[PDB]
Design a protein around this ligand. Structure first.
Ligand SMILES: O=C(O)c1cc(C(=O)O)c2c(n1)C(=O)C(=O)c1cc(C(=O)O)[nH]c1-2
Ligand SMILES: [Nd+3]
Ligand SMILES: [Nd+3]
Lengths: 588, 588
C-alpha cells in the first residue's frame, strides 16, 4: 500500500503495528536520548475503560492516535495535536458474542490495528475483521472470518497490503484449523484464504514453492494431509495468530503458523515410539510451525519452512519475522530474523527461505542443534514429551524462549537485536484424548513450569543474530512480556510484568530511567513526534497467557491451572499485580 | 483516639480520611511550592484492578499506604518506603452480596478507610464494617451493620474515635431509615446506634439537647414522629453517608443526615399546599437534613440543627463539617464550616450549633436567606417542587451547590476555604407514589438538569465563609467532583471530571501545573512525606452520581436517566470520558 509506505517512512508517525512492514519497531527520533532520558516524565495518561491484558500498541497518524482494547475490543480515537494532552474524538464499541471469551486460550488480548487510506482495520475477539472510517469512526464494513464454534478467536493485528487486509486467528488449543486470508480493503469481501494444512490445493502452493529447497517439502506431495494421522489435520492447529510482515520490492507477505493442535504427540502419529514418530517426512504435521512467504495478489506461497516438525512442546512458530539486510558470509543478503518459541533464532534468506543462521537465544535442551543440510532439528529423546502418563522436562517451556512479545532492531546495525526472553522450563505429561469435538478444549496434557533460575524469569538481551552471542543480558525478577523499542537516541525500551517501564543504553544495557506503572506491561512501546517534540507511549495492564491466572481469577492452589502457569505465577507473586489498562505517554 | 491524634499531628502522614479529625485537608509540607510546582512529575502509579468511581483517598501511615477501591471494595496495602516506587504488602478481597450494586443509588463508590493502633477499618458496599490487621491484612473482625434488603449500602468512610468505630450508610432513595452507630475498635459490636427519625429514644437525644437553641427542636416532643405523616418515618431517610468529624477537646462527633426519602414532597406531609405544608414544626421531617453533635461514649446528642425542614429538592445535608477556630464578631470562636447541598455555606458554633453565618456559595433561588431568629429558610414557592405533575425549576439542582467532594481549609487562614462547586439547575416534576416497598427505588420524580451558564459546569472557588464573598473563581467546563487539598507551599489541588489534575496558586487561583490523567478525578488529593521527599497522590476513574451514566452504561438518549444526570452528561461529552481506576503519585 502506497499510503502505508509513505506514513511508515515518516519518522513522526507509528503507522504500522511494528512501526513498518518489516516489523523493525525502530524509531529514528533522537530528541529523547541517553543524555536526557534521565528527565523522562509522564505527559498524559489514558485509561481504556477495559480490564485484562493490554497487548499491542497504539497507532499514530499525524495528530491522531488509535487504541484497541482487549475484549470487547473498544476502539478509542484520540486527538494529540497538542502533544502534552489528549482529547477523545470518538469511540467504537462492537457488540460481540461472549462465547469468544471462553473460547480464547490465552486471554482476551488484542495486538493492535492497522491504518491505510483514511481507514482503520482491526480484529474482534469473536472473529470479525472490521474497517472503520478513521475520521469519524463510522463502521465502513465488517466481515465474519473466524468461527467461535470451530475454536477460532481473532487476537492478532492485521496488516494492509496495497488493497487487501490480511490476518489469521488463534485456536490450536481448541482443535481449530489454521487459516490466513486476505480481504478487499474497500469492500471487505474475502479474496483468498490459505489453510495451514490439508490438501495442496487448500494450502495454495505456488508453482515454484520451495523450488530451491526441495528438502523443505514441495507441492504435489500433499504433506498437509499425510504428515498427520487419518484426519487429525482437520483439528491440526496451524493458526496464524502472530505478527505479519511484507516486502514491497519482493511482493511477499510473511507469517507463521502455530502448533499442530493437541499437546499429546502420540495422537499426531501412528508410531508408538519417539524415534519412529520422528521419522523424517512421516509425521511432520505440516504445514504447522511453518514460516510462509505468500504473494499478496493470490496468496500462493513462494516458499515455506517448518521449524518444528511433529511438535511435542507447543512451540508455536508465529513469532514476528523481522526483515533486514545483513552483510553475512561475504555479502549483503535480504534476511528474515525470527526468534522462535523453540528457543532458536532463525536467520533466513527472505527470497527463498535458505537457512543462514540458527542459534539458541535461551536455554535449549529439547534439540541439540538445527541440521544445516536437512533443516530439521536434532531432537533429544529425554526432553521430548511423547508417552501418556510420563512427565518430560524441556527447556524452554511451552511459552518458549520468546512468546508473542516482539523484538526490535536498528536497520543501521541489523545484526544486533533487542529481544525480551522467557527463561523457565516445564515438565509436560501427555494425557489420553477424551474427545474430538472441534471448538472445545483440545490439549490433553498437564504442565508444570518452574523458572530455570530462581529469582530470574525474564531477560532483555542485545542478541547478535549472526554470531549467536549477546552483547548484554539483563535478568528480571518478573517476565519480560512486553515488546521492545529501539531509538536512534541510543536507547532500548521494554517493560516488566510487575509494572516497571525501563529505558536502557543500547551499547551497554545499563538502566538510565525506570518508573513503576499501574500494572504489568505487556504492550509494545512506541515512539512518535507531535509539534516537534518526541513522545513515548506504552500500554499497561497484566494479562496474556503469562497473566491468565490473574485476569481469569484462577485458583492459586492449582499449579496445573492455566496450562501450567498458575503454579509458577502463584510462586512468583503474580497475584499481587493488579489488573488494569492505561496508555502512558512520556516526554523530556 | 490517641494514636490517631499523633499520626495526624505529624505532617509527614495522612492518617485520617480528611487528614485530621477536623477534616481540614491541609498539609503543612512546603517541600513542594509555588516556585517549583511547574516541574511536578509522576513518580509511580498503581492500578486498583477495579473499575467505576474511585472516590475517597489513600491513607499514608509512616510509609505504608492503604487504598480502598470501589465495589467489591478491595483493600490494597502498599510499601512506599522507597518513595519513588511501590511494593504491594497485602491484598484483602471481601466476598460480597451483589445486590448492593443494584441497591446503590449513585455508583459503587467508597470514600476511604481509617487507621488506629495498627488496625484498618472500612465499609463494604454490602453493609459490613471490617477491621483488618494493618501489618498482615488478616480479618480481625467483621460486623454486619447496613442491610441491603432495607435499602442500605455503606459508601462512606468511618473514623476511629478513642475506641469506637463510627459510621453511617446511604439509601435514602431506596426508602431506608438512616442510622449512625459506633462499634468497639477491639471486639467490634455495636455500642450504640442513633436513628435519624422516629421516637426521641431512637434518636438518642440527651437531657440537654438543644439547650441554648430551643427554636431548633428539643427532646420530649418526638419531632421525628410528628414532622412526618403517620408512618413515613420508617422510610424517612436521613442516612448519614457523608464525612464525619471529631473535636477531642469538646468530645463531640459531627455528622449530618440526608434527605427524608422520596422526592415527592406531597407524600411527606398531609397538607395540600406548599404554604400549609411548610408550617413550622408540622412537617419538618426531622431529623433529616440535620447537623448532629454527639458524645462518642454514649451517642446522645448535645445539639442538632435541621438546615432544610420539609425537603423538596433532595438537598442531602451529609456534606463534611470542617472544625476550625475563626476570629469573627469580635473574638475567636470554635466554628464548624459546612458547604451544604442546598447552596448555603453554614458557619456554626460547634459547641452549641449557634448560627454565625449562612452565605450562598452558588446561585440559590429556592430560599431567599436563612433567618437567624428562627433558623429556618425563607422558601421561595415558585422554586419549591410540591404538587404531583408540576415541573418546578430550582437552583441548585438535586446535586446541590456541592455534593460529597470535600473542601479544604488552612487553619492559618480559617476564613478562606478552597471548595469545589456544582453550577447547574434542574426542573423536578413530582410524580405519584407507585409503591411503599423499602429496598426498591423510592424517588417518584422526573428530574432534568442543565448548567446555569453554557460552557461552565464546575467552579473551584476560594470562598470567605465569613464575608460570603469569593477571593477567586475558576470556571471549569466539566464538573469539579474531586476533593480539594491545600498546602503550606501556597498551592491548592483539585481535579476535573475529564481527567485534569490541577495545582493552583492559593493567592490568585492561577493554574501553575496541570496534567490530564487516565480518567475523571473524583478522588481526594493527599500530601505526605517519605524519605525526606514530599509526594502528592490522588485517585482517578469517573464515577459517583455525576459519572453514573457512564459507569452504569445508561442510554444516552434517555435524558431522565440517572435521576436526571444522563441528559446533562450526554450533552456535555461525559460519554467520551473512559472509565478507570488508578492512583497517581507525583513529586518534584
Ligand atoms: O495456538 C493457538 O491457537 C494460540 C493462540 C494464542 C492467542 O490467540 O492469544 C496463544 C497461543 N496459541 C500460545 O501458544 C501462547 O503461548 C500464547 C500467549 C499469548 C499471549 O497473548 O500472551 N497468546 C497465546
Ligand atoms: Nd499454542
Ligand atoms: Nd439523596
Amino acid at each position: 500500500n502506497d499510503d502505508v509506505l509513505k506514513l511508515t517512512e515518516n519518522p513522526k508517525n507509528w503507522a504500522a503495528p511494528g512501526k513498518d512492514y518489516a516489523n523493525t519497531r525502530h524509531s529514528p527520533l533522537k530528541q529523547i536520548n541517553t543524555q536526557n532520558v534521565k528527565g523522562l516524565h509522564m505527559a498524559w495518561s489514558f485509561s481504556t475503560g477495559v480490564l485484562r491484558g493490554h497487548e499491542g500498541q497504539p497507532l499514530v497518524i499525524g495528530d491522531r492516535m488509535y487504541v484497541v482494547t482487549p475484549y470487547p475490543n473498544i476502539v478509542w480515537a484520540l486527538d494529540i495535536s497538542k502533544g502534552n494532552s489528549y482529547e477523545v474524538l470518538w469511540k467504537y464499541a462492537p457488540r460481540q458474542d461472549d462465547k469468544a471469551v471462553s473460547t480464547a486460550c490465552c486471554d482476551t488480548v488484542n495486538r493492535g490495528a492497522s491504518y491505510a487510506d483514511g481507514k482503520i482495520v482491526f480484529n474482534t475477539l469473536d472473529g470479525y475483521v472490521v474497517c472503520l472510517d478513521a475520521n469519524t469512526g463510522k463502521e465502513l464494513w465488517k466481515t465474519k472470518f473466524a468461527d467461535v464454534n470451530k475454536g477460532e478467536t481473532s487476537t492478532p493485528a492485521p496488516i494492509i497490503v496495497k488493497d487487501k487486509v490480511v490476518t489469521g486467528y488463534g485456536g490450536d488449543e481448541f482443535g481449530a484449523r489454521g487459516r490466513f486470508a486476505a480481504f478487499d480493503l474497500n469492500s471487505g469481501k474475502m479474496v483468498w484464504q490459505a489453510y495451514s494444512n490439508g490438501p495442496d490445493s487448500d494450502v495454495l502452493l505456488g508453482p515454484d514453492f520451495n523450488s530451491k529447497h526441495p528438502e523443505y517439502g514441495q507441492a504435489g506431495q500433499d504433506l498437509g494431509v499425510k504428515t498427520y494421522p487419518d484426519e487429525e489435520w482437520k483439528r491440526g492447529g496451524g493458526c496464524a495468530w502472530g505478527w505479519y510482515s511484507y516486502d514491497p520490492k519482493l511482493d511477499l507477505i510473511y507469517y507463521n503458523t502455530g502448533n499442530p493442535g493437541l499437546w499429546s504427540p502420540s495422537y499426531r502419529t501412528e508410531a508408538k515410539t519417539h524415534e519412529e514418530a520422528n521419522e523424517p517426512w512421516k509425521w511432520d504435521n505440516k504445514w504447522s510451525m511453518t514460516i510462509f512467504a505468500r504473494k499478496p495478489d493470490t496468496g500462493e506461497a513462494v516458499w515455506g519452512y517448518q521449524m518444528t516438525p511433529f511438535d511435542q512442546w507447543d512451540y508455536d512458530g508465529i513469532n514476528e519475522d523481522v526483515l533486514v539486510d545483513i552483510t553475512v558470509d561475504g555479502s549483503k543478503k535480504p534476511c528474515l530474523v525470527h526468534f522462535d518459541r523453540n528457543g532458536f533464532c532463525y536467520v533466513l534468506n527472505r527470497t527463498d527461505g535458505t537457512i543462514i543462521r540458527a542459534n539458541k537465544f535461551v536455554t535449549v535442551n529439547w534439540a541439540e542443534k538445527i541440521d544445516m543440510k536437512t533443516g530439521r532439528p536434532v531432537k533429544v529423546k529425554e526432553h521430548s514429551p511423547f508417552e501418556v502418563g510420563k512427565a518430560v522436562q524441556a527447556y524452554p517451556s511451552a511459552m518458549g524462549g520468546k512468546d508473542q512479545q516482539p523484538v526490535a532492531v536498528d536497520p543501521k546495525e541489523p545484526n544486533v537485536f533487542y529481544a525480551p526472553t522467557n527463561n523457565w522450563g516445564m515438565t509436560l505429561e501427555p494425557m489420553e484424548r477424551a474427545h474430538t469435538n472441534q471448538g472445545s478444549v483440545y490439549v490433553f496434557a498437564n504442565v508444570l513450569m518452574k523458572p530455570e533460575k530462581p529469582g530470574v524469569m525474564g531477560r532483555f538481551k542485545a542478541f547478535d543474530v549472526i554470531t549467536g552471542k549477546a552483547r548484554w543480558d539483563i535478568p528480571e525478577r518478573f517476565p519480560t512480556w512486553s515488546g521492545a523499542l529501539v531509538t536512534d537516541g541510543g536507547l532500548a525500551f521494554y517493560g516488566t510484568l510487575d509494572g516497571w517501564f525501563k529505558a536502557v543504553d543500547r551499547k551497554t544495557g545499563k538502566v538510565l530511567w525506570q518508573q513503576k506503572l499501574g500494572s504489568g506491561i505487556i504492550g509494545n512501546p512506541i515512539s512518535y513526534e507531535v509539534g516537534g517534540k518526541q513522545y513515548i507511549s506504552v500500554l499497561s495492564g497484566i494479562g496474556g497467557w503469562i497473566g491468565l491466572p490473574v485476569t481469569a481469577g484462577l485458583d492459586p492452589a492449582d499449579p496445573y491451572g492455566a496450562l501450567g502457569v498458575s503454579g509458577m505465577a502463584a510462586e512468583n507473586g503474580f497475584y499481587n499485580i493488579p489488573m488494569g489498562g492505561t496508555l502512558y505517554t512520556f516526554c523530556v
